[PDB]
Amino acid sequence: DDIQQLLKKINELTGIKESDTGLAPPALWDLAADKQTLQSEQPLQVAR
Amino acid sequence: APAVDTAEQVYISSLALLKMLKHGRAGVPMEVMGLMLGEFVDDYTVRVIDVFAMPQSGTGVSVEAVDPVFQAKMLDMLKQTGRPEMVVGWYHSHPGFGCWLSGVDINTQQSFEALSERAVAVVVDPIQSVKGKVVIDAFRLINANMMVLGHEPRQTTSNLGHLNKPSIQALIHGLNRHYYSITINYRKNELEQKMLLNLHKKSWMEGLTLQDYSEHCKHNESVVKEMLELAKNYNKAVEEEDKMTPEQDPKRHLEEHVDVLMTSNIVQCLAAMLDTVVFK
Amino acid sequence: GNLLFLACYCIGGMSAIKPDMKIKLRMEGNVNGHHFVIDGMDLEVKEGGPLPFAFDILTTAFNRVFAKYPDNIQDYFKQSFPKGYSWERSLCNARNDITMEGDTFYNKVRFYGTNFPANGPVMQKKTLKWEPSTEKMYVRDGVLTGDIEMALDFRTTYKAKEKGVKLPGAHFVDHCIEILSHDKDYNKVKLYEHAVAHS
Ligand SMILES: [Zn+2]
Structure with a gap:
């Protein structure tokens, strides 16, 4: 019983970790232009 | 550099608020808009004395929805009547969308602010304005250079600008990032309030008209029967009180029925006998 | 023949939302040979890559902004608002148009x-x-x-x-x-675009 309880203890405490989103390496970022596109360009729904 | 104080208020007149609500509802589910006239009394006051609607256009609510001919002629002829107030700002209705400014709303507000730095963009939700609460807000803007430099949009000198809390719905739609909410106060003098009081001011007559006596007796019968059932429940509950240490109430309902009975019958008796003795 | 089959049902959820329509401040032109279109006051050419001509030939055509006027000089640029002012520019000619195409408030500066x-x-x-x-x-x-x-x-x-x-x-x-x-x-x-009036 203690072995099972400790196993669940480790499982809940070990966590999740990343969960690392698709972030490009720096110096490839044009955050200014990215914001410009966000505030300027618009999405389009596709259709048949 | 001068900064707009957070204590600045928008004093909307009673007439302006009523016209704004009526026009906003009349255009549901479309978004209607119009111009608010008034005066910038000082750096901390924007008085909206009156607001006139504008003809609906298929564009929606944009800077192309202000027909120059309509605005100019309306202003000229109002000035003839005696209302020579400048165009303080503009208003439009977000039916069920809450109070905030969209990208195009921010755009038209930039256009208006180019006319005068002080200019408000009050919006009103006409279907969320159910009797009681009125869902309406007023926003100006934040200059982009002001925000990017890190300085706060508005200087603060009092608690007036923070008595009310911003809404989440407005906050996600850009509040405190591109536009700031301006506190709204309603200028209601005694005369306007007394005039509005006539809406439900009953009469000099219904103070003297007795209830339909058969209807009165039937109501008395029904309430007394309900009160009998409630008394049975009250007795049953009180018997439990004894065999129960400190650990809907048939009593509270009983008290409410008693109060309604006494008020109804006392009023009916007194009105009846006042009638007997004032009418010969 | 004696089929008499029942029927199941698989619903498909469906919904969308029109966002706040985004104003694109874009200029278009075909001054010499290229249908150049630029978005913008930071400037970025959308189509019509590195220009066969200099940028200056088109830099003079750039609502919502007006020159600064003193109190003595009547500010036709300012009081023309909220609607704004439409101008014809002759260099090559330039006109500014306000259109409602698609879901973008188009402030064309068509060149x-x-x-x-x-x-x-x-x-x-x-x-x-x-x-x-x-x-x-x-x-x-x-x-x-x-x-x-x-x-x-x-x-x-x-x-x-x-x-x-x-x-x-x-x-x-x-x-x-x-x-x-x-x-x-x-x-x-x-x-x-700095510019001040002088009497
Ligand atoms: Zn809007």
Whole structure:
């Protein structure tokens, strides 16, 4: 019983970790232009 | 550099608020808009004395929805009547969308602010304005250079600008990032309030008209029967009180029925006998 | 034959939402050979990559903004709001249009030109600067014509949508427009539009 309880203890405490989103390496970022596109360009729904 | 104080208020007149609500509802589910006239009394006051609607256009609510001919002629002829107030700002209705400014709303507000730095963009939700609460807000803007430099949009000198809390719905739609909410106060003098009081001011007559006596007796019968059932429940509950240490109430309902009975019958008796003795 | 089959049911959830329609401040032109379109005051050419001509030939065509006027000089630019002012610019000609195409508030600054010299100084991309230029603004036939000399003729005409605003007297507004920041390919540009009125 203690072995099972400790196993669940480790499982809940070990966590999740990343969960690392698709972030490009720096110096490839044009955050200014990215914001410009966000505030300027618009999405389009596709259709048949 | 001068900064707009957070204590600045928008004093909307009673007439302006009523016209704004009526026009906003009349255009549901479309978004209607119009111009608010008034005066910038000082750096901390924007008085909206009156607001006139504008003809609906298929564009929606944009800077192309202000027909120059309509605005100019309306202003000229109002000035003839005696209302020579400048165009303080503009208003439009977000039916069920809450109070905030969209990208195009921010755009038209930039256009208006180019006319005068002080200019408000009050919006009103006409279907969320159910009797009681009125869902309406007023926003100006934040200059982009002001925000990017890190300085706060508005200087603060009092608690007036923070008595009310911003809404989440407005906050996600850009509040405190591109536009700031301006506190709204309603200028209601005694005369306007007394005039509005006539809406439900009953009469000099219904103070003297007795209830339909058969209807009165039937109501008395029904309430007394309900009160009998409630008394049975009250007795049953009180018997439990004894065999129960400190650990809907048939009593509270009983008290409410008693109060309604006494008020109804006392009023009916007194009105009846006042009638007997004032009418010969 | 004796099939008599039941029927199941698989629903498909369906919904969408129109966002806040986004104003794209884009200019278009076909001055010499290329249908260049630029978004923008940071400038970025959308289509019509590295220009066969210099940028300056089109930098003068750049609502929502107006020159600074003193209290003595009537600010036709300012009081023409909220609607704004529409102008015809003659260099090559330029006009500003406000349209509702799609879900974008289009503030077109549509450009157009002709009579491009085969070795004119506008296409070799040579450029020093634009020296401060004074526009004499005056009314000819009910239209606010601004005559400006180009130094590096301009016959600007400004008409307000509110055709009731009084016409200011003939004054001399000094414009100082220079290409502040850019790249060699001229695809990431920052423009300066400073201009003050002078009586
Ligand atoms: Zn809106």
